[PDB]
Design a protein around this nucleic acid. Structure first.
Length: 95
RNA sequence: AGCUUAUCACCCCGGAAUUGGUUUAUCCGGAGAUGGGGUCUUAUGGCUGGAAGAGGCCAGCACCUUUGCUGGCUCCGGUGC
């Protein structure tokens, strides 16, 4: 269950929301996992994948739109991409 | 004609729930709000050149007359379903 794993990292780990801040984290090497919404434009999705290739960052594709991804991270606004800086008690990186 | 002048739009920094901003009219923001600093269109307005030498309003003089001559002032504001 990705929703339960993603909910746990919010309460303990360090995360980052939004496209502009995610690219900054990948550029600095601080990112460990990126989650992309289903309805993200392909050109933006293609650019994010290219950035993760250069920094050797694992990419996960969320099975839902930006409305659904925002709910999973416990926010009342749409989220297009989520960058995980470091996990806490969750094992999302090892699953 | 020169300088300058803008709602909208756009850029940089930054990263938002204790949701904020905002129109008479409810729309916008992690696809990046509010905020701080910038860029641009010149509708339009301001100052200056054009240009006071013009035009306007008066006063004092010549005189059949071709008809003129000499003087001053022409400034500074307010208001709107």
């Amino acid at each position: 269950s990705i929703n339960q794993k993603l909910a746990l990292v919010i309460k303990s780990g360090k995360y980052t929301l939004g496209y502009k801040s995610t690219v900054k984290s990948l550029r600095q090497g601080k990112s460990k996992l990126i989650i992309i919404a289903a309805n993200t434009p392909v050109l933006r999705k293609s650019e994010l994948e290219y950035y993760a290739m250069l920094s050797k960052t694992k990419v996960y594709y969320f099975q839902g739109g930006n409305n659904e991804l925002g709910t999973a991270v416990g926010k009342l606004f749409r989220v297009g991409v989520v960058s995980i800086l470091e996990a806490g008690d969750s094992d999302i990186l090892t699953t």
